[PDB]
């Protein structure tokens, strides 16, 4: 199978991982100096947030130059050294390709805003790189994504005297994919990095490329067409590289981003649909929403693999759940107003779960056991918290906590000189939560996570198996099998905070002998009608093999 | 009904708990400021280590004055205010009555060593307070308790020109209980504290009062007779006060220390027999030793209550297990030979259990679920570590860790000026393990402990019920009922580190449903032959009641 199917991904922000030069900003030399940590954790692929020059109004997702390294992060040479060192350790690396929009500081937009013709009457070739309007009335009733900042998807530019489209901040003007030149520019950006040996891209905001009058301006066939263009380019010119889509949409919309066997699109898509139902099922002590949303996911192509995740650098998005699920989620996971942003919840995993290690482990087990390749958000493996005093979504992007020394080991500069301040509170601060402590503590979360990955790695059915949900007679207990190449796994998870009984329907496995993956402790052989009783402790996870 | 049967005890050392004035030494005004913490935790009775003037060669168990407060700890006025403040909050307080021996700095012994006659020719009345010998040849083949330090139970006093007896350090000369004045002096010392309102005593080293030639000089009938005299004195003069015995002896010798209905002795005795079997069963993944040692304990009198404990200010003693068991325990729990002392292991609870919170909870639940009144060792409720850099047993006696401030909040004195240095290592240090963190952390060990005590408190069967072991079909799974006043609890505990299947013998409860004590979730009703299948995750504890 393709490499990305067997990978474990790790998401990090270079500016926030390791400062290698004392200026309070993370950088590539710093990242390079920490690759053994990632190697030894059990990670195979690093996904780096945007590393491009940018005034950072959306933390680098406002790109000013696609073919450069932001000066905070070092130089292109540093980037090539990093990539060489990552590759030498068996780490693949993917970048973040921001296709839908650029910074307003990008030279193209600086050019475009002069208007349709240059001062001397000549056509301004860059004007058409962006999406302009006389009165900002096209595409009405299309949704606003950054609901807490933007009141419209059109903003008046003072210099051009016309409106320009933007699905995100006003400082992120949308690119005009009806202009063939724009398409070519982004194929070119992609080539630049793939020519350096980058293993692929996470592609940002894929559903919003094309706008059409009388549509939602999301998931349009025309957008898919373009994305297939990217795939074909990579298949012809860079065989084996990964395209991974950020498509935060309903199940049936998301699965379209894989394309077809005849017309391939992405290799991978994040499982956005399952992610909120994990947190919901935990609070409701009822896992039906997980089965229901997985059941709405169509079959994907041969080459396709889901990318499973718990959290990421953004808020926990609630955009694609119902109004009642959303309200439930806010009540359960955002009791203070400042915890919410833009139709979502800007908190880290450990805080979301009351720092309850039994729950954190539970959800990580499900992360690793569902069909796909999992992605860890940096620092969740040590139980980092958040800083909701920081604006926007920056409170989940505080510096990695390496040790208890100056600024959590992130930098030799003092905390208050760090790009974002390293967490110091009594619960989650680097005094208490840091890699070094957890390397010495035999029972740490760091250790637990590396061990759980090693356990996953010893059973390829987690990465490659099919999935079948098993009836349990108790909504609190989730059970499924993963089968691949002669091994059947049975995964049984209790989402309730107290002990629970179930009656598993193991009819198809009469005469099979369940044993724990860890140590092969035997459970009773399945007999009779195969209705198999279980009890589980609070937040328990049973990882089993059904010997044939 | 008697208060001590319903109490949760907490063992602490005043010198090591809270320093109020900043000299590096814990004191009474300091302890007084922390009474709300102990109350809120769910503690009812404080047992304080010896608070008496002493040169501290055995950390205060070498008493130089039975009727004062050691200057380190404040004044007798401080003690009274402390006692008033504890009672004001509905706490009980017991002290540590050191009956077997005094410090060699005690004036009695300073007098005694001058010999039978004073310089004025008069007889020396203090000489017979201690146990003298011309050649130290009596009582040979008595066990030496401090095996790592002492070569003999006799030591030649150079002034007296004679040998004196000591079961502990040579600086702890044994008192002569065949002298009736000695008995009266210790009745008087007891009176002194009981008249101030002290609620009782923990009585130190009770098996060793009387020596007799041709015996082991432990547990002799004459020693029990003396102890019965303390009980009579208390029952007549101070009804309701507690006498708790430290007798580290085999089951049938320990039970002797309760006395009988007709001839009462101690109200409570520490359950030394079960303590080492908890740890051994965890590492063996086999609980049969717990059932065997509990089964070997005779019924105790009506007024009697066991005091159950996991650890204390001493080493985990292995003196009263078999050679095979001892070798097993050393291998499992003393990987470094420095961790051994006096036929036991000088480590704290959390380190012993590899800081595994799942195991720490399991053993704590077992401690709370077995018959008796539990005693918690200060700092175990936050997961304190140990410091083997300190001599003797002092490595488990480091200052309590309140916050991440100056010396873990124990003192404004620097760590190196504290009586014992606060732990500062990366795993257990005060930056990582402290009260204030755990008060803010919704899922801390501290909160967990408070909540589990609350749960225990809501079910009087734990404090007062009978006990009946239940067949499980799996030695890893321990199961028992506790029955009292119309309620039957069912407590099931997995001592293995992976999932285990069981088949519980619940034939006596066909037609009843087990339900969780926590959150009232019912489990399937018992039916048919009452053989009840369970599965348990690693180190799970199921606290259930059996409904009608
Ligand atoms: Ca667009
Ligand atoms: Ca004696
Ligand atoms: Mg830097
Ligand atoms: Mg002091």
TrEMBL record, chains A, B:
Residues where Mg(2+) binds: 19, 21, 23, 25, 27
Entry similarity comment: Belongs to the glycosyl hydrolase 13 family. TreS subfamily.
Keywords attached to this entry: Calcium, Isomerase, Metal-binding
Classification via InterPro entries: GH, GH13_cat_dom, Glyco_hydro_b, Malt_amylase-like_C, O16G_dom_2, TreS/a-amylase_N
NCBIfam families: treS_nterm (TIGR02456)
The keyword Cytoplasm is assigned to this record: no
A Pfam family it matches: Malt_amylase_C
Annotated Glycosyl hydrolase family 13 catalytic domain residues: 11-411
MF-aspect GO terms: maltose alpha-D-glucosyltransferase activity; metal ion binding
Descriptive protein name: maltose alpha-D-glucosyltransferase
Reactions that this protein is recorded to catalyse: D-maltose = alpha,alpha-trehalose
Keyword field contains Oxidoreductase: no
Transmembrane segments: none
């Amino acid at each position: 199978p393709e490499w990305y199917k067997s990978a474990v991904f790790y998401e990090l922000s270079v500016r926030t991982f390791q400062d290698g030069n004392g200026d309070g900003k993370g950088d590539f030399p710093g990242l390079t100096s920490r690759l053994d940590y990632l190697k030894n954790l059990g990670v195979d692929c690093l996904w780096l947030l945007p590393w491009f020059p940018s005034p950072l109004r959306d933390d680098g997702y406002d790109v000013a130059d696609y073919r450069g390294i932001h000066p905070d992060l070092g130089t292109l040479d540093d980037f090539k050294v990093f990539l060489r060192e990552a590759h030498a350790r068996g780490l693949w690396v993917i970048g973040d390709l921001v296709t839908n929009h650029t910074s307003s500081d990008h030279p193209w937009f600086q050019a475009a805003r002069r208007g349709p013709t240059l001062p001397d009457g000549s056509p301004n070739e860059y004007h058409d790189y962006y999406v302009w309007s006389d009165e900002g009335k096209e595409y009405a009733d299309t949704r606003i994504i950054f609901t807490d900042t933007e009141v419209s998807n059109w903003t008046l530019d003072e210099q051009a005297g016309k409106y320009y489209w933007h699905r995100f901040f006003a400082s992120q003007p949308d690119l005009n994919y009806d202009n063939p030149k724009v398409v070519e520019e982004l194929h070119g950006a992609a080539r630049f990095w793939l020519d350096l040996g980058l293993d692929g891209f996470r592609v940002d905001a894929v559903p919003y490329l094309i706008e059409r009058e009388g549509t939602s301006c999301e998931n349009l066939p025309e957008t898919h067409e373009i994305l297939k263009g990217f795939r074909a380019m990579v298949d012809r010119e860079y065989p084996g590289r990964l395209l991974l889509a950020e498509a935060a949409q309903w199940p049936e919309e998301v699965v379209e981003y894989f394309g077809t066997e005849a017309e391939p699109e992405f290799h991978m898509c994040f499982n956005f649909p399952v992610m909120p139902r994990l947190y919901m099922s935990l609070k409701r002590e009822d896992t039906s929403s997980i089965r229901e949303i997985m059941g709405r996911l169509p079959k994907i192509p041969s080459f396709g693999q889901w990318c499973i995740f718990l959290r990421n650098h953004d808020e926990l998005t609630l955009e694609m759940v119902t109004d009642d699920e959303r309200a439930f989620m806010y009540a359960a996971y955002a009791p203070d107003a400042r915890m919410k942003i833009n139709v979502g919840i800007r908190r880290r995993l450990a805080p979301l779960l009351d720092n309850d290690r039994r729950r954190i482990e539970l959800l990580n087990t499900v992360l690793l056991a569902l069909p796909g390749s999992p992605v860890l958000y940096y620092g969740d493996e040590i139980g980092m918290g958040d800083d909701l005093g920081l604006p926007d979504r920056n409170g989940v992007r505080t510096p990695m906590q390496w040790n208890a020394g100056t600024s959590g080991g992130f930098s030799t500069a003092q905390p208050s000189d760090c790009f974002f301040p390293p967490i110091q509170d009594p619960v989650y601060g680097f005094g208490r939560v840091n890699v070094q402590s957890q390397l010495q503590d035999p029972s740490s979360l760091l250790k637990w996570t590396a061990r759980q990955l090693e356990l996953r790695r010893a059973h390829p059915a987690f990465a490659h198996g099919d999935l079948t949900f098993i009836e349990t007679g108790n909504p609190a207990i989730l059970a499924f099998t993963r089968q691949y190449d002669g091994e059947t796994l049975l995964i049984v998870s209790n989402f309730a905070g107290n002990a629970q009984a179930g009656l598993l329907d193991l009819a198809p496995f009469v005469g099979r002998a369940p044993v724990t993956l860890s140590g092969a402790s035997p459970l009773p052989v399945v007999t009779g009608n195969g209705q198999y009783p279980v009890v589980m402790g609070k937040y328990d996870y049973y990882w089993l093999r059904l010997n044939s």
